[PDB]
Amino acid sequence: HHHHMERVSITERPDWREKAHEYGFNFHTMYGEPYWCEDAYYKLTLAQVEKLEEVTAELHQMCLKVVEKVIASDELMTKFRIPKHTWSFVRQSWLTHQPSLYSRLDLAWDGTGEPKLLENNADTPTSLYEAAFFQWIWLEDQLNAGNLPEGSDQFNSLQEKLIDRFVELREQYGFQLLHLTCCRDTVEDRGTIQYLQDCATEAEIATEFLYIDDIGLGEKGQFTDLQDQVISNLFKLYPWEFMLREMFSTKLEDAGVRWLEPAWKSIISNKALLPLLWEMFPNHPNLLPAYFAEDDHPQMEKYVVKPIFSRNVSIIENGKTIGPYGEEGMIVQQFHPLPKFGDSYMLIGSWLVNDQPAGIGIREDRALITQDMSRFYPHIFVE
Template sequence: MLRLPMTPRRNLADIAACYGFHFHIIDGEPYWDESRAYRFTLQQIEQGIEAPTEELHAMCLDLVGRVVADDALLTQLAIPELYWDAIAASWRRQEPSLYGRMDFAWGGSGPVKLLEYNADTPTSLYESAFFQWLWLADSVAAGRIPAGADQFNSLQEQLIQRFALWRSADPLYFCCCRDSQEDRGTVRYLEDCARQAGLDTRFLHMEEIGLGVGGVFTDLQDRTLRQAFKLYPWEWMMRDDFGPALRGGRTQWLEPLWKSIVSNKGILPLLWRWYRGHPNLLPAYFAEEVQRPGWRLAQEMGAQWRGFVRKPLYSREGANVAMFSDRDGLRCEAMTGGDYAQEAQIWQACAPLPRFGDDYTLIGSWLVGDRAAGIGLREDNSPITKDTSRFVPHFIA
């Protein structure tokens, strides 16, 4: 895994505008950054990233089956009791999932380390699946990278194939909040993939969803939403005024309700509990475990871990994360603000991101259904990857 300097395309702004990449610049700063690129070998991709991604996903599915049958675990994950039966029913019905993204710390050698699983509402999809592939084709044609270069990226093909599961007489609604250009771009891209799969699609802002007679969700014309994709977290939906209507199961949601378990950072200590010592996992514990009298976090984690990270169960884009560079929690190396300070927390051993110059690099490994489908890399000038991070393309040579 090498980071190489690259020459950006002269007409990048025109290309982005042509293909609807309206958020390649965010708040006046470049979000898409092709002044560098990461080079991988095929072995690094297949053995180092692809295989662990699918194995970790299978472990997470096993975890869901355990959690829905255990009230104590549902409580530990801070999932409201009101929804326990509905989540279990969603799991028993084997409602299909569409996609997800695992975030890894990895510098190209040794096993990748799972930092978290964005299993419900992951973004950076359009740039990973489409614009990154377009960059590869243009860069090969211009001779900037080797003629035989490839990319770990079958996202678009797999998404189109996966959407066939929702082909029916009912339209598939695509929903996101107003005033987020990035979310709208992600939803627009997914809607396009669904149309290529032969689905009838419609768009609706989350704020426009209504509640009809009998507790059914409706659109602006009072038509029932029988199936809908939402770029809106389950924990928010459960706390909304209309949340209790989710228990009726009248709408098939993408992602399904059981994904509220996998998208919870509490799966990290549960994975460690059941797969302790797995090479792709980091030691992780719930805050209540760490706070037990006489319990020593450093001793439990082992001598090889020199620091740890504190994370809320529900947190997005690196919000309210604290990173400590010592075993006693006295030296805080980095801390972020946010809206999740009151959430329950976990503690996880620190696997520092690889550093290239002043940038820290995070690998996002995508799944479509149960299959690994590609990667996207983000850089940040902080060891905690935030919403101000930059997306950098990759290739295999």
């Protein structure tokens, strides 16, 4: 398999599991978070990193164009499956310019051709802790042990940009006190929450963690915390796709809470994004053909049908029409295999902090069709 990036074997640091334990990083797979691996790393070039950076910034602007178009159209809000009882909540979040913290794009690329957008995890993207912090320490450690090329660098400014963004949220948007939440018995001990809380603390934001089921309902519709005090700003590791359909989700519109990620990110964190991107930016070098499966659309020789929702996938070929999952609620996307390095397919996770590209985290998986890649590998770039 010819690639312009290499997967380089390396001797694992002997104590990395305890390094994880000391930081409170549970590196085991859970809720789509990948298993940490470091018996190899990926090596990119400076040219490849500048290309990924360029493409990531532009795709994010393209996604912002999709939101404006969807927000304005009842028809498109329906096609994106935003529940009608939440349209006012979601639209007001966009029309008042509610701020974003982060996004992760998933890009298929081995350095040959153009990178292709497979999805924008713009709500609850996994592998933040590994990409921002753990692989940074890995780089410093393995440089010090003499196990990496002398000029090794890493496309990764996540921690710096996250702290700067929290400062910006505090100073210019009034995020003085930030609550953080997730569902009980999910990812509270993975590392992410504590890490983002540490970043917010460094930015001089006061923080409180509480589980989703800890949140109270006040007499005037306000959401309240473990001290029965009002929640004003709430970061969540729990997706809008679920919350907008949950019991008492009609209360969101009047709760007086500002959200990270904000409600309008629901529109770019599902697969309906991919057909709209292709319609608004036809033959864009970094997009793949995509259509709603229910629409009349060109026939593709080999393609993949994915549910609009993030809750598995099937492949079709030889110009056939649509399958166990059917047509309804599905999109279709031109089949485009991931690069194969040995026994595993590789996927590039490319991060944004608000609208600024902030680096990459690489994942692998032995299956072609997978919602969340099973394994994470650190990377470097040279030259």
